[PDB]
C-alpha cells in the first residue's frame, strides 16, 4: 500500500542504484491528492534531507526539486514556510549540521533555494532565508 511514507522510502532508498523516477514522480503526484498531503510530504522530506547517508539525502533533494518544479500552491507554500526552510538551513550551517555534510548536498540545497527565489517570487520567506544565508556568508 503506497502512502507518502512508503513512496518516499522507495524514492530515497540508499540501495537504489540509480534515481527511481517512477517513485519520485509518484510521490509528487500523490502528495496533492489530499488536503494534509503537502505538510506530511514536507515533514518526511525534511527528515530524509538531513540524513548522514549522502545518497539518501541527495535522492530526497531530487524528490523535493521535482515536486517544486510542478504547479501546486499548497506544496509551494509549505516548502515556503520557515518550518521547512529551517530544516534545509540546518544542513548548510556550520552551527548545526553543516560541518558534517558533504559539499555536494550543501551546494544542491543552496542552488535549489536560489532557483526558487527566481522561479517563485511570491514565496517571500524563501527569499528571506536565502538573503540570510548570503549575509551570514553561506552563499558566497
Amino acid at each position: 500500500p503506497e502512502t507518502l511514507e512508503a513512496r518516499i522510502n522507495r524514492a530515497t532508498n540508499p540501495l537504489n542504484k540509480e534515481l527511481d523516477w517512477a517513485s519520485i514522480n509518484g510521490f509528487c503526484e500523490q502528495l496533492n491528492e489530499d488536503f494534509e498531503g503537502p505538510p506530511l510530504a514536507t515533514r518526511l522530506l525534511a527528515h530524509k534531507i538531513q540524513s548522514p547517508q549522502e545518497w539518501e539525502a541527495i535522492q530526497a533533494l531530487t524528490v523535493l526539486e521535482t515536486c517544486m518544479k510542478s504547479c501546486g500552491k499548497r506544496f509551494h507554500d509549505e516548502v515556503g514556510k520557515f518550518r521547512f526552510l529551517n530544516e534545509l538551513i540546518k544542513v548548510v550551517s556550520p552551527k548545526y549540521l553543516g560541518s558534517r555534510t558533504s559539499e555536494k548536498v550543501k551546494n544542491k540545497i543552496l542552488e535549489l533555494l536560489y532557483s526558487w527565489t527566481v522561479g517563485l517570487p511570491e514565496e517571500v520567506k524563501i527569499a528571506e532565508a536565502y538573503q540570510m544565508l548570503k549575509k551570514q556568508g553561506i552563499v558566497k
Partner: peptide, 7 residues
C-alpha cells in the same frame, strides 16, 4: 509558522 532559524 516558526521563526527563521538563528545561525
Amino acid at each position: 509558522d516558526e521563526d527563521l532559524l538563528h545561525i
